[PDB]
Structure 1
Amino acid sequence: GRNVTIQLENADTGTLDTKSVVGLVMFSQFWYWFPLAHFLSLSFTPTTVIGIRGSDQAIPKFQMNCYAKEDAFSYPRMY
């Protein structure tokens, strides 16, 4: 989906992120027992700005300005 990243640590608070750590140590071992890769799921966190209208806790459709080059920050190239 190309919309998930792996956070080394939380960047909002500057505090090491438990899930992510735990995910990575199993992921690294996959020779011994091969299912363990799947635990990398824990380290995958969505990063997006989602505006939420506070007055009932639902998702409003509105538009934001972002001053940027449009073309580069398109989703990665198709094949």
Structure 2
Amino acid sequence: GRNVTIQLENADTGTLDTKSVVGLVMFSQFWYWFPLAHFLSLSFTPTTVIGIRGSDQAIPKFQMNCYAKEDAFSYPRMYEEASGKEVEKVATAVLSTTARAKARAKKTKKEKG
């Protein structure tokens, strides 16, 4: 749900995230047996800053100042997908034909009369 990113290595210690790598080798091979495909799952790692209030293990609601440009890190949209596309495309096809079947005649005589 647009919340994971794939980590290559741990960037803090400069050292391989093991679980991810094994995911990827097993993922590549799938020509032979397609359900090898599922091992791509293990490479997903979620990304978020999570504060922990004391040692209670509860998440505070608070906020942090971030000097950045908003547009950059706008929360990615809900996509149109193929379903949304059909509806929108067919709506445009209707209009487009109708348009030109009337516009051509109308424009010529619009002004002259």
Note whether the superposition's TM-score is higher than 0.5.
yes
| % identical equivalent positions | 100
**3-state DSSP class of the match of 1:49?**
coil
Larger radius of gyration: 2
TM-score by length of 2: 0.65
How far residue 12 of structure 1 moved from its aligned partner, in angstroms, is 1.8
Q: Secondary structure at the match of 1:52?
A: coil
Q: Which has the higher strand share?
A: 1
**Deviations 1:25-75 (Å, cap 9, x if unpaired)?**
010011000001111111100111011112411101000001101122112
Number of equivalences: 79
Higher-helix-fraction structure: 2
TM-score normalised by length of structure 1: 0.91
Q: Which runs of 5+ in 1 are unaligned?
A: none
Q: Distance in 2 between matches of 1:28 and 1:78?
A: 29
RMSD of aligned residue pairs (Cα, Å): 1.1
> Secondary structure at the residue paired with 1:53?
coil
Cα shift at 1:76: 2.3
SS of corresponding position for 1:51: coil
Deviation, 1:3, is 1.1
- 1:25 alignment partner, SS class: helix
